[PDB]
Amino acid sequence: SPILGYWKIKGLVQPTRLLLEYLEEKYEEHLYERDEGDKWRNKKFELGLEFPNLPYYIDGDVKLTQSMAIIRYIADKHNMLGGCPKERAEISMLEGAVLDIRYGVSRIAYSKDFETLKVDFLSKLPEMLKMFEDRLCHKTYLNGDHVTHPDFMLYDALDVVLYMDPMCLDAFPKLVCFKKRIEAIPQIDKYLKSSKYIAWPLQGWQATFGGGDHPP
C-alpha cells in the first residue's frame, strides 16, 4: 500500500488525493498536523528521498517529491497521461493553466497585504476561467470524454477560488456544472462525505487566506 505524505490541509495535494480516490486505488496517508513541523523534520531525511520535501509519495522504492511529478506518476501508472506527443502535451498545457490559477491564489495568500491583492487577482481571474469555459464547450471533461488529472486540478482550483469570491463562477455556469459533475462521480462523492476528506484549511495554517483551524 503506497504512502502519501503531506500537511493535513488541501494545499498542493488535494487534486492527487481526489485522483487516488477516483481510481479507488488503495493507499495510506502520513498527515502532518498544524503543530508537527518537527515530526516532519525528524523524518524529512530518514525516508530516502533524493529531494526531501512535501508532499512525498513512496511505495516500492519509488520515492517521489514535487506535487506534479507525483500526480503525473499515479496518472501514468494507469495510462492517463496521453497516447501520443500531441495529446500528452495537451494534457500538460491543461496542467499549466490550472496551476496558473491555483498558484495565483497561494502566492498572494500568505501576504499580510492579501485583502488588497486579491482585488487584482479576481479581476484577472475572469479571463483565466473563461479559457476553461471554452475548453469545456462540446466536451464533458477537459481533454475529452475520459477524465484526466487536470480535471481534478481545475476542480480544486474552482473549489478554492469560490471561498475567495463566492460569485466568481456565476458568469461561468459551464464550470459550476463541471464542478457538480465531478462531485457526482460515485467514488468522489463517497469520498467528500467520508472521514478522510480534509475540508480545511486550504493553505498552510499560517496563511491569511484559507488559513486558520476552521473556515470563517
Curated annotation (Swiss-Prot):
Highest taxon, organism lineage: Eukaryota
List of residues binding glutathione: Y6, W7, W40, R41, N42, K43, K44, N53, L54, Q66, S67
Catalytic activity: RX + glutathione = an S-substituted glutathione + a halide anion + H(+)
SUPFAM superfamilies, per the entry: GST C-terminal domain-like (SSF47616), Thioredoxin-like (SSF52833)
Start and end residues of each GST C-terminal domain: 84-202
Pfam families (UniProt xref): GST_C_3, GST_N
Entry's Gene Ontology molecular function annotations: glutathione transferase activity
Matches recorded under PROSITE patterns: GST_CTER, GST_NTER
Keyword Transferase included in the entry's annotation: yes
Positions of substrate binding: Y110
One GO BP annotation of this record: glutathione metabolic process
Keywords, in A-Z order: Transferase
EC number annotated for this UniProt entry: 2.5.1.18
GST N-terminal domain span: 1-82
Enzyme class, UniProt record, top EC level: transferase
Family according to the record: Belongs to the GST superfamily. Mu family.
More about this protein: There are at least two isoenzymes of GST in S.japonicum.
Subunit details: Homodimer.
Function (record text): Conjugation of reduced glutathione to a wide number of exogenous and endogenous hydrophobic electrophiles.
Official protein name in the record: Glutathione S-transferase class-mu 26 kDa isozyme
